[PDB]
Motif scaffolding. Structure first.
Motif, PDB file in Angstrom:
ATOM      1  N   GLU A 181     -10.884   4.059  -2.754  1.00 55.46           N
ATOM      2  CA  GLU A 181     -10.802   4.736  -4.042  1.00 55.46           C
ATOM      3  C   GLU A 181     -12.144   4.887  -4.740  1.00 55.46           C
ATOM      4  OE1 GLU A 181      -8.238   6.460  -5.274  1.00 55.46           O
ATOM      5  OE2 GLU A 181      -7.549   5.980  -3.230  1.00 55.46           O
ATOM      6  N   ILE A 182     -13.015   3.894  -4.585  1.00 55.65           N
ATOM      7  CA  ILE A 182     -14.338   3.930  -5.204  1.00 55.65           C
ATOM      8  C   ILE A 182     -15.218   4.958  -4.500  1.00 55.65           C
ATOM      9  CG2 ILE A 182     -16.531   2.680  -5.423  1.00 55.65           C
ATOM     10  CD1 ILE A 182     -14.443   1.944  -7.543  1.00 55.65           C
ATOM     11  N   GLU A 183     -15.083   5.030  -3.184  1.00 55.51           N
ATOM     12  CA  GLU A 183     -15.881   5.955  -2.402  1.00 55.51           C
ATOM     13  C   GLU A 183     -15.446   7.389  -2.688  1.00 55.51           C
ATOM     14  OE1 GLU A 183     -16.120   5.123   2.001  1.00 55.51           O
ATOM     15  OE2 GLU A 183     -17.884   4.023   1.315  1.00 55.51           O
ATOM     16  N   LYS A 184     -14.145   7.594  -2.856  1.00 54.46           N
ATOM     17  CA  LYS A 184     -13.618   8.923  -3.137  1.00 54.46           C
ATOM     18  C   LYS A 184     -14.174   9.536  -4.428  1.00 54.46           C
ATOM     19  CE  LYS A 184      -9.028   8.482  -0.895  1.00 54.46           C
ATOM     20  NZ  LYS A 184      -7.555   8.475  -1.184  1.00 54.46           N
ATOM     21  N   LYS A 199     -19.100   4.030 -22.436  1.00 51.70           N
ATOM     22  CA  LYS A 199     -18.979   5.469 -22.268  1.00 51.70           C
ATOM     23  C   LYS A 199     -19.955   6.108 -23.240  1.00 51.70           C
ATOM     24  CE  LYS A 199     -15.762   9.288 -21.941  1.00 51.70           C
ATOM     25  NZ  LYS A 199     -14.353   9.739 -22.068  1.00 51.70           N
ATOM     26  N   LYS A 200     -19.988   5.571 -24.455  1.00 54.25           N
ATOM     27  CA  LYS A 200     -20.881   6.071 -25.483  1.00 54.25           C
ATOM     28  C   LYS A 200     -22.292   5.841 -25.006  1.00 54.25           C
ATOM     29  CE  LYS A 200     -17.667   4.758 -29.183  1.00 54.25           C
ATOM     30  NZ  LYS A 200     -17.485   4.003 -30.461  1.00 54.25           N
ATOM     31  N   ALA A 201     -22.498   4.727 -24.310  1.00 52.60           N
ATOM     32  CA  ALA A 201     -23.815   4.372 -23.794  1.00 52.60           C
ATOM     33  C   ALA A 201     -24.329   5.363 -22.745  1.00 52.60           C
ATOM     34  CB  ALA A 201     -23.772   2.971 -23.211  1.00 52.60           C
ATOM     35  N   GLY A 202     -23.416   6.117 -22.141  1.00 54.55           N
ATOM     36  CA  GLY A 202     -23.824   7.083 -21.139  1.00 54.55           C
ATOM     37  C   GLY A 202     -23.308   6.767 -19.750  1.00 54.55           C
ATOM     38  N   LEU A 203     -22.657   5.616 -19.603  1.00 52.24           N
ATOM     39  CA  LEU A 203     -22.115   5.223 -18.312  1.00 52.24           C
ATOM     40  C   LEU A 203     -20.811   5.953 -18.057  1.00 52.24           C
ATOM     41  CD1 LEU A 203     -23.801   2.877 -19.590  1.00 52.24           C
ATOM     42  CD2 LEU A 203     -22.580   1.345 -18.037  1.00 52.24           C
ATOM     43  N   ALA A 204     -20.622   6.398 -16.820  1.00 54.69           N
ATOM     44  CA  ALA A 204     -19.404   7.096 -16.432  1.00 54.69           C
ATOM     45  C   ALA A 204     -18.339   6.061 -16.097  1.00 54.69           C
ATOM     46  CB  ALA A 204     -19.674   7.975 -15.219  1.00 54.69           C
ATOM     47  N   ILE A 205     -17.267   6.009 -16.882  1.00 60.49           N
ATOM     48  CA  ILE A 205     -16.188   5.051 -16.638  1.00 60.49           C
ATOM     49  C   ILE A 205     -15.349   5.535 -15.455  1.00 60.49           C
ATOM     50  CG2 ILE A 205     -14.376   3.698 -17.708  1.00 60.49           C
ATOM     51  CD1 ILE A 205     -17.077   3.618 -19.135  1.00 60.49           C
ATOM     52  N   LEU A 206     -15.433   4.823 -14.330  1.00 57.59           N
ATOM     53  CA  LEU A 206     -14.704   5.184 -13.113  1.00 57.59           C
ATOM     54  C   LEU A 206     -13.212   4.888 -13.203  1.00 57.59           C
ATOM     55  CD1 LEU A 206     -17.131   3.625 -10.479  1.00 57.59           C
ATOM     56  CD2 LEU A 206     -17.173   5.971 -11.320  1.00 57.59           C
ATOM     57  N   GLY A 207     -12.862   3.899 -14.015  1.00 54.82           N
ATOM     58  CA  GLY A 207     -11.469   3.523 -14.167  1.00 54.82           C
ATOM     59  C   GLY A 207     -11.382   2.014 -14.214  1.00 54.82           C
ATOM     60  N   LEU A 248     -17.139  -2.404   1.034  1.00 52.93           N
ATOM     61  CA  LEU A 248     -17.980  -1.225   1.185  1.00 52.93           C
ATOM     62  C   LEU A 248     -18.927  -1.405   2.358  1.00 52.93           C
ATOM     63  CD1 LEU A 248     -18.813  -0.351  -2.532  1.00 52.93           C
ATOM     64  CD2 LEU A 248     -17.295   0.832  -0.962  1.00 52.93           C
ATOM     65  N   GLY A 249     -19.499  -2.596   2.463  1.00 56.53           N
ATOM     66  CA  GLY A 249     -20.422  -2.872   3.545  1.00 56.53           C
ATOM     67  C   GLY A 249     -19.705  -2.814   4.870  1.00 56.53           C
ATOM     68  N   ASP A 250     -18.406  -3.068   4.836  1.00 57.58           N
ATOM     69  CA  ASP A 250     -17.615  -3.050   6.052  1.00 57.58           C
ATOM     70  C   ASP A 250     -17.403  -1.611   6.515  1.00 57.58           C
ATOM     71  OD1 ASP A 250     -16.241  -4.533   8.037  1.00 57.58           O
ATOM     72  OD2 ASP A 250     -14.313  -3.996   7.109  1.00 57.58           O
ATOM     73  N   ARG A 251     -17.600  -0.664   5.604  1.00 53.23           N
ATOM     74  CA  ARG A 251     -17.439   0.748   5.915  1.00 53.23           C
ATOM     75  C   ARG A 251     -18.802   1.401   6.105  1.00 53.23           C
ATOM     76  NH1 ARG A 251     -12.610   2.973   3.839  1.00 53.23           N
ATOM     77  NH2 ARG A 251     -13.724   4.931   3.388  1.00 53.23           N
TER      78      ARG A 251
END
Ligand SMILES: Nc1ncnc2c1ncn2[C@@H]1O[C@H](COP(=O)(O)OP(=O)(O)CP(=O)(O)O)[C@@H](O)[C@H]1O
Ligand SMILES: [Mg+2]
Length: 237
Positions: free
Chosen positions: A232-235, A159-167, A27-30
Motif C-alpha cells: 500500500e505504501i509503494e502504491k 499537513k499545514k507544514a507541507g508534508l503529504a499525509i499518506l494516511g 520494503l527492503g524485502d521487496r
C-alpha cells in the motif's frame, strides 16, 4: 527514489517503532534500499529493535557536529535495510541539536528509496524536529478514541507544514471488545486507512528478539499485515 516518510502518532505506545521496523524490513524485502532513522533522541530504541546493538557513531554525534552522517549509517541483518541509530547516554541526548535533523536527514534523500523516521510522540521540540524532517507522513494509531483524535490533529499540523499525509495505520486492532472498527475509525481520521495491524503477540516476540515480526515469524497475522502495508505504501507513488 528518495521518499522520506515520517512515522508519527499523537499519543504514544501506539507502535511507531514497530511500524518503522517492520515496514522497513518489508520494503527492503521487496528490493527497496531503506534507511531506518531513529528520531526519538530522548529514548533511542529503533536500532535495538533492528538488531544493531552497540554502534560507535550515532545520530546524536551528527546532531552535535561531531560526525558526518555518512559515518552514522550501519548495515542490519536485513537485506536493503540500513539504520541511522541513536545514542542512549544522557550526555549525547544533551549535545544533540534537534533543529539540525531536517537538514541532516534530507541530505540522504538521494541514497535511499525510502527513509523512514521513527518519531517521538508529542508536539515538543524533539518530536516536531523529527516529524518535520519528512516530506510524507504515516499516521500510526490505536482503536482508542482519545488516540484517534490527537493523531488526527497532528496530521493537520503536518499537513499545514507541507508534508503529504499518506494516511494512517490502525494498529493493535482486535485487542479489546471496545476497539473502534476499521471503516468507522476511517471516516473519523479522514485520511485513507492504509492497513490494519492486529494485536499479535508475534509482533512483541519480534521486538524482544531484535528481528521484526514480518521477518522473524513470516506466517503470523502481523507479519502478513505488514507486507500488505508495504504494498500500500509503494502504491502511493
Ligand atoms: N499490533 C501489535 N500487537 C502486539 N504487540 C504490539 C503491536 N504493536 C506494537 N506492539 C508491542 O507494543 C510495544 C510498544 O510498541 P512500540 O515500541 O512500537 O511503540 P512506540 O514506538 O509507539 C513507543 P513510544 O511512544 O515510546 O515511542 C512493543 O513492545 C511492541 O512489540
Ligand atoms: Mg518508540
Amino acid at each position: 527514489m528518495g521518499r522520506i516518510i515520517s512515522i508519527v502518532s499523537g499519543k504514544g505506545g501506539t507502535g511507531k517503532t514497530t511500524v518503522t521496523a517492520n515496514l522497513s524490513v518489508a520494503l527492503g524485502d521487496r528490493g527497496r534500499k531503506v534507511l531506518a532513522v531513529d528520531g526519538d533522541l530522548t529514548m533511542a530504541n529503533l536500532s535495538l529493535v533492528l538488531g544493531v546493538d552497540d554502534p560507535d557513531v550515532t545520530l546524536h554525534d551528527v546532531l552535535a557536529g561531531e560526525a558526518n552522517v555518512e559515518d552514522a549509517i550501519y548495515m542490519t541483518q536485513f537485506d536493503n535495510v540500513y539504520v541511522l541509530p541513536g545514542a542512549v547516554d544522557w550526555e549525547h541526548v544533551l549535545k544533540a541539536d534537534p533543529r539540525k535533523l531536517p537538514e541532516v536527514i534530507k541530505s540522504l534523500k538521494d541514497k535511499f528509496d525510502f527513509i523512514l523516521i521513527d518519531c517521538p510522540a508529542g508536539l515538543q521540540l524533539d518530536a516536531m524536529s523529527a516529524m518535520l524532517s519528512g516530506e510524507e507522513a504515516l499516521l500510526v494509531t490505536n482503536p482508542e478514541i482519545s488516540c484517534l483524535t490527537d493523531t488526527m490533529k497532528v496530521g493537520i499540523v503536518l499537513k499545514k507544514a507541507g508534508l503529504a499525509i499518506l494516511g494512517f495505520v490502525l494498529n493493535r486492532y482486535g485487542r479489546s471488545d471496545r476497539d473502534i472498527p476499521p471503516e468507522a475509525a476511517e471516516d473519523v481520521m479522514e485520511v485513507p486507512l492504509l492497513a490494519v495491524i492486529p494485536e499479535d503477540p508475534a509482533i512483541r516476540e519480534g521486538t524482544l528478539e531484535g528481528i521484526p515480526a514480518v521477518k522473524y515469524k513470516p506466517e503470523s497475522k502481523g507479519a502478513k499485515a505488514f507486507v500488505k502495508l508495504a504494498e500500500e505504501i509503494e502504491k502511493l507513488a
